[PDB]
Amino acid sequence: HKIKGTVVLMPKNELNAFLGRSVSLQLISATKADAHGKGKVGKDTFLEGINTSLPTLGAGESAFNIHFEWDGSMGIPGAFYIKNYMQVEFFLKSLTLEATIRFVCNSWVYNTKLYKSVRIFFANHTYVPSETPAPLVSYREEELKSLRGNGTGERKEYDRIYDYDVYNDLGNPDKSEKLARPVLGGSSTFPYPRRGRTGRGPTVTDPNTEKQGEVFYVPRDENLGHLKSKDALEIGTKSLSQIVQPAFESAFDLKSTPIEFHSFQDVHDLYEGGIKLPRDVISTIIPLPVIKELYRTDGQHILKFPQPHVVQVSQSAWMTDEEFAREMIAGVNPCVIRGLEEFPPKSNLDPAIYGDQSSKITADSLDLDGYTMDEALGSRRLFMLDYHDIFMPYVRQINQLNSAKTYATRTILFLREDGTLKPVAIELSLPHSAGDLSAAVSQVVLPAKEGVESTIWLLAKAYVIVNDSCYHALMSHWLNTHAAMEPFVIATHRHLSVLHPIYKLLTPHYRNNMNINALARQSLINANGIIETTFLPSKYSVEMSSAVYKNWVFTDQALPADLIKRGVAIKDPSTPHGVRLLIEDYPYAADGLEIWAAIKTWVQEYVPLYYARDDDVKNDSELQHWWKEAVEKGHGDLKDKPWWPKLQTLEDLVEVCLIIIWIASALHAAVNFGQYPYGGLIMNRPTASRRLLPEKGTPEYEEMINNHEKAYLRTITSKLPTLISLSVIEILSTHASDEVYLGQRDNPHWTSDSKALQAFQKFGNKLKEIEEKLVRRNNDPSLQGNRLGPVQLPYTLLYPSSEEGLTFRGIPNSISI
Numbered sequence: 037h038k039i040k041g042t043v044v045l046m047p048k049n050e051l052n053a054f055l056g057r058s059v060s061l062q063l064i065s066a067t068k069a070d071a072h073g074k075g076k077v078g079k080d081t082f083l084e085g086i087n088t089s090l091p092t093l094g095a096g097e098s099a100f101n102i103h104f105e106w107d108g109s110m111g112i113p114g115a116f117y118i119k120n121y122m123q124v125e126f127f128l129k130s131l132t133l134e135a136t137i138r139f140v141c142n143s144w145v146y147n148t149k150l151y152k153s154v155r156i157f158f159a160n161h162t163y164v165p166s167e168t169p170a171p172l173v174s175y176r177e178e179e180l181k182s183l184r185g186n187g188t189g190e191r192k193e194y195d196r197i198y199d200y201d202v203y204n205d206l207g208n209p210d211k212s213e214k215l216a217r218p219v220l221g222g223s224s225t226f227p228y229p230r231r232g233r234t235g236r237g238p239t240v241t242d243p244n245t246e247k248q249g250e251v252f253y254v255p256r257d258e259n260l261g262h263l264k265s266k267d268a269l270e271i272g273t274k275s276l277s278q279i280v281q282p283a284f285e286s287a288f289d290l291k292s293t294p295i296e297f298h299s300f301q302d303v304h305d306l307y308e309g310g311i312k313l314p315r316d317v318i319s320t321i322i323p324l325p326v327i328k329e330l331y332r333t334d335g336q337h338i339l340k341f342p343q344p345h346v347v348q349v350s351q352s353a354w355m356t357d358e359e360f361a362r363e364m365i366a367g368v369n370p371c372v373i374r375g376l377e378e379f380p381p382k383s384n385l386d387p388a389i390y391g392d393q394s395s396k397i398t399a400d401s402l403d404l405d406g407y408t409m410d411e412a413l414g415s416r417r418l419f420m421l422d423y424h425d426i427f428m429p430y431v432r433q434i435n436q437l438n439s440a441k442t443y444a445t446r447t448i449l450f451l452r453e454d455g456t457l458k459p460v461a462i463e464l465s466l467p468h469s470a471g472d473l474s475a476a477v478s479q480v481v482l483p484a485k486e487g488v489e490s491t492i493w494l495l496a497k498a499y500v501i502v503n504d505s506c507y508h509a510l511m512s513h514w515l516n517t518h519a520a521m522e523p524f525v526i527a528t529h530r531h532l533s534v535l536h537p538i539y540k541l542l543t544p545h546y547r548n549n550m551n552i553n554a555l556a557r558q559s560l561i562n563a564n565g566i567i568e569t570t571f572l573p574s575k576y577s578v579e580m581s582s583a584v585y586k587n588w589v590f591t592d593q594a595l596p597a598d599l600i601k602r603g604v605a606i607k608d609p610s611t612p613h614g615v616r617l618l619i620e621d622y623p624y625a626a627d628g629l630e631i632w633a634a635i636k637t638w639v640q641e642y643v644p645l646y647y648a649r650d651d652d653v654k655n656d657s658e659l660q661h662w663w664k665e666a667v668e669k670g671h672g673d674l675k676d677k678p679w680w681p682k683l684q685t686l687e688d689l690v691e692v693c694l695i696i697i698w699i700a701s702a703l704h705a706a707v708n709f710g711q712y713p714y715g716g717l718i719m720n721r722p723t724a725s726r727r728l729l730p731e732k733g734t735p736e737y738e739e740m741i742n743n744h745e746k747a748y749l750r751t752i753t754s755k756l757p758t759l760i761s762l763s764v765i766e767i768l769s770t771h772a773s774d775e776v777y778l779g780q781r782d783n784p785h786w787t788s789d790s791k792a793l794q795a796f797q798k799f800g801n802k803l804k805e806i807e808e809k810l811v812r813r814n815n816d817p818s819l820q821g822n823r824l825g826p827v828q829l830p831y832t833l834l835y836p837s838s839e840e841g842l843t844f845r846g847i848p849n850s851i852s853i
């Protein structure tokens with residue numbers, strides 16, 4: 037009596053050597069236990085041969101036949117051990133036992149000698165702890181214990197140990213004191229989400245900073261391999277910082293290309309005829325995977341970037357006040373604008389430190405289309421993009437840097453009767469303290485279409501967008517998605533068994549997150565990394581995100597809560613989503629509520645399948661340990677806050693899962709995939725400002741009058757950092773062809789529970805339904821103003837589906853790039 041089995045695997049390089057005694061499997065009983073209650077284990081069974089039957093098997097996968105000596109007396113198998121005797125590791129896809137038991141593995145199996153304990157895999161059945169078959173209970177807990185490790189040791193490539201550590205690996209003090217950075221996390225001064233522990237040990241000069249490493253470890257299965265090298269987008273950041281950036285820098289050091297852009301056409305040239313660079317620079321770029329997909333080239337001297345979506349219909353539309361305001365609700369960073377319910381706007385900052393903080397904007401100077409200020413306030417037509425209190429504490433130190441000058445800005449917006457937003461004033465604030473050496477002062481700038489006044493207003497918009505791009509990159513994007521999510525990924529693997537229903541519900545939403553984050557700590561947010569060298573704050577960039585994290589609230593990440601907290605919607609039970617938008621045609625929010633509702637329905641239908649009552653949640657030992665750790669360790673610097681859900685009810689479980697899935701999928705997609713589409717034209721999304729407004733009677737002032745484009749270009753991001761920044765956002769705005777989107781799973785057998793599978797199928801049908809609805813919105817002529825704007829760019833960032841590439845649409849399951 038033998039059990040026919042089929043093993044599917046993928047050789048490292050993407051067959052006969054797997055035969056003989058190279059690979060052994062041992063079935064484990066889920067019903068028959070030894071003298072210790074542990075499922076009985078069969079004999080070592082090696083692969084018998086290659087199965088070349090079923091056409092249903094692609095992706096460089098190969099199937100192997102195998103038969104197990106398993107009598108009905110050994111009970112029913114529910115798990116199995118596997119040992120790889122070969123030198124090289126292989127990727128185990130699955131095991132299928134006929135007469136059907138399925139095992140979804142998708143895990144790298146290294147040589148048996150590298151493992152402390154034998155790799156164990158479970159059948160695709162789902163069990164809360166109290167439902168674990170008795171013979172698998174100890175195996176279940178031992179595997180979790182193996183995943184947690186002991187909190188010590190330098191992690192190796194094949195390790196599968198999940199643990200936490202602070203952000204003490206960004207500075208490079210051993211190379212230079214100038215690259216020393218404060219540790220983020222673990223202090224009241226610098227609170228911060230934790231990240232995955234790597235354990236490389238301390239630097240030589242600072243026992244609190246982790247030494248450098250050529251490879252930043254992530255548990256093995258978190259490091260996603262790809263069939264196509266072009267899909268390994270995450271490695272592009274490393275290549276860009278380590279290889280391409282130096283190549284670009286040499287071209288400028290050698291004066292082979294003008295150091296600065298001299299006109300707007302010089303910028304447009306980048307995606308038209310291209311930029312000519314030294315042959316050796318082109319040759320350095322053209323052969324790199326991922327990087328070579330970023331530019332078209334003649335193979336000799338030309339690099340051509342792709343035409344950004346924002347200029348595809350009108351190359352000048354970005355300069356309109358209409359587009360400036362529209363992007364606050366349908367642009368790359370559509371989630372910062374707030375309702376303004378009083379006037380003038382107020383500040384909570386200390387005047388003793390920054391000087392009188394009262395606003396200089398006068399109500400009578402504003403054009404509110406005939407409305408009085410009281411009418412605008414009462415009708416909820418006044419809004420603002422407020423970076424005054426956020427930036428003021430950092431303005432002095434930023435402006436002390438050689439090539440950086442910024443203002444803490446505030447923009448007032450009026451919601452017109454036609455439903456579009458219009459900018460009516462920009463306040464450019466600077467701190468003032470007795471003894472300041474600078475004579476520059478704060479000022480208010482009003483809209484202007486002609487003369488030098490129009491140039492000053494255009495520059496004021498640039499200062500505002502430099503604040504916005506910095507806040508978007510560091511807070512809306514990095515902190516709120518990438519960084520805030522990692523602690524939950526770690527806790528999930530450490531406390532929820534692969535058999536756990538919540539593990540199955542949440543893990544698809546973590547795909548590639550730890551991997552891109554580790555590569556980010558190494559090349560994106562590190563000392564002298566991409567962000568520090570391309571954005572305004574320089575060496576103060578990441579710590580600014582720590583200051584902002586002091587105010588991060590998990591429950592305020594829920595879309596309705598966010599909209600209400602920002603004063604852009606009010607609670608209204610008579611509405612489908614329970615909230616009424618104050619800007620009715622707010623694309624991000626309107627489309628977002630649809631996706632939010634679909635995820636909610638899915639979570640509300642899934643949870644009840646495994647938890648009947650609130651008591652079943654309080655009594656799930658794994659679930660309680662998971663949440664307790666996620667909060668007290670993962671986001672431990674905020675463990676003293678009262679807003680954390682308790683997770684003692686079905687309601688709380690649904691809430692926590694819904695928010696986690698929202699952040700990982702739709703929120704990240706909405707703030708991530710519009711980076712190159714909107715920011716690919718540096719004038720539309722400047723990452724830095726290098727000078728304050730000029731004083732009358734100076735050559736700089738005369739320049740605003742005689743050469744406004746040059747005045748603008750000298751103020752924003754320089755040409756070299758612009759080339760580096762455009763390259764990184766082009767990578768980050770690209771969808772890998774092997775992405776798994778919302779409504780999809782990487783395997784149709786993730787669970788054997790038909791009820792869960794049916795619920796998931798309904799969720800995907802609902803997303804398709806939603807996409808048709810969003811298409812109708814974009815085609816509705818009455819919504820053209822905010823959904824398309826003068827740039828005529830349909831808001832498709834929350835469309836659920838997408839083909840590969842730089843598409844400006846599609847919601848992946850996770851923070852995958």
Ligand SMILES: [Fe+3]
Nearest residue numbers: 704708851853
């Ligand atoms: Fe991202």
